[PDB]
Design brief:
The complex is a heterodimer of chains A (61) and B (216). With 61 residues, chain A is an alpha+beta fold. Chain A contains one helix and four strands, in the order ββββα. Chain B has one domain. Chain B is built from three helices and eleven strands, in the order H-E-E-E-E-E-E-H-E-E-E-E-H-E. The chains are: A alpha+beta (61), B mainly beta (216). The interface between A and B is medium-sized, with 24 and 30 residues. The site of a molecule of 3 linked components (NAG-NAG-BMA) has 7 residues of chain B, from strand 4 and strand 7. Chain B: GO terms for molecular function: identical protein binding. Chain B: InterPro entries: Orthopox_35kDa (IPR003184), Pox_vCCI-like_sf (IPR036540).
């Protein structure tokens, strides 16, 4: 339903994150991953960036 | 300003943060949107404990709903509280495609003292420069459709949002009385200067609603 128009550039520490989900819809222009922080606000992140892919790995484990 | 000048002169070695957002959202409605003057405004502060960290996580969240659109602005810091004191909306209630305007501001130090981010060798400033997050989100209510840089996330539902233009700043409250400051962040999406100008003259042709929190 929702699209990421602007990304968080810097890496947030894994501890500050909570949950994660991807976005691959045709409606949205750029590919994106949406992390949910402890304080229950969602954050847009670029998957073309190792720090995001590593954050996804940690959440899986 | 009378309160301001006295403060900035009497507090010249300190640094108080001041967040300001001016945002314009291009609005479109579902065919079943019924025009409404309704406005909903809220400001919520929360505190969460981090696992390996000694520093609490502080969030201030301003929300507004009007014209079928619901907006969320969250400013999050690690060890640093920057609370919102003001949200204002400018909106057209009709079906026609229109612009929604949003102001969001943090408490001015002279009204009620925020923390001196210059204390302990500028510890507070380092936290903001390194950790502060801004998450702006924009959705479509319960409309049914047919089936230096501030680090900011912008997340929108495109079914009701045709455009976003915003300017956002996090700066030394008293930067007008200083040649330089370690605290001066800024952010843009689209034409930020344009929205910063437009938003000061929308009361002529828009519903205006605002929420200002108790000072003191
Ligand atoms: C704009 O308003 C809409 C509608 O109020 C918000 O979306 C809705 O958010 C609610 C949370 O209050 C969601 O309900 C949740 O459902 C899931 C199950 O799918 C469950 O995990 C939760 O316990 C909760 O019951 C709802 O799904 C969601 N969407 C709709 C269409 O209603 C939206 O959050 C608001 N946008 C902004 C930026 O604030
Ligand atoms: C966002 O914040 C800005 C800055 O505080 C607000 O700008 C203010 O806009 C109002 C009207 O929109 C200006 O009103 C002035 O007074 C009378 C009202 O009858 C009007 O006839 C004058 O011509 C004049 O515009 C006010 O000067 C202006 N303030 C500043 C400091 O520029 C704006 O209202 C806020 N936007 C929202 C809530 O959407």
């Amino acid at each position: 339903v929702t699209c990421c128009y602007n990304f968080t550039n810097r890496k947030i520490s894994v501890q500050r994150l909570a949950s994660y989900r991807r976005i691959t819809s045709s409606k949205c222009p750029k590919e994106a991953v949406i992390f949910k922080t402890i304080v229950a606000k969602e954050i847009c992140a670029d998957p073309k960036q190792k720090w995001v892919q590593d954050s996804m790995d940690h959440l899986d484990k | 300003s009378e309160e301001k000048a006295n403060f900035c002169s009497t507090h010249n070695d300190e640094v108080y943060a001041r967040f300001r957002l001016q945002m314009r959202v291009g609005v479109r409605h579902s065919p079943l949107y019924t025009p409404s003057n309704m406005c909903m405004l809220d400001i919520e502060d929360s505190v969460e404990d981090i696992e390996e960290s000694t520093e609490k996580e502080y969030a201030s969240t301003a929300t507004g709903e009007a014209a079928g659109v619901n907006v969320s602005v969250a400013l999050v810091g690690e060890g640093v509280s920057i609370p919102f004191s003001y949200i204002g909306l400018g909106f057209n209630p009709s079906l026609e495609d229109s612009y929604l305007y949003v102001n969001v501001s943090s408490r001015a130090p002279w009204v009620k003292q925020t923390s001196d981010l210059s204390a302990n060798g500028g510890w507070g400033i380092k936290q903001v420069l390194e950790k502060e997050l801004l998450a702006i989100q924009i959705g479509c209510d319960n409309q049914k459709f047919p089936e230096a840089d501030i680090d900011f996330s912008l997340l929108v539902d495109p079914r009701c949002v045709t455009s976003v233009d915003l300017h956002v700043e996090l700066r030394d409250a008293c930067i007008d009385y200083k040649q330089e400051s370690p605290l001066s962040l800024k952010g843009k999406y689209g034409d930020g200067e344009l929205v910063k100008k437009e938003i000061k003259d929308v009361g002529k042709n828009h519903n205006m609603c605002s929420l200002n929190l108790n000072p003191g």
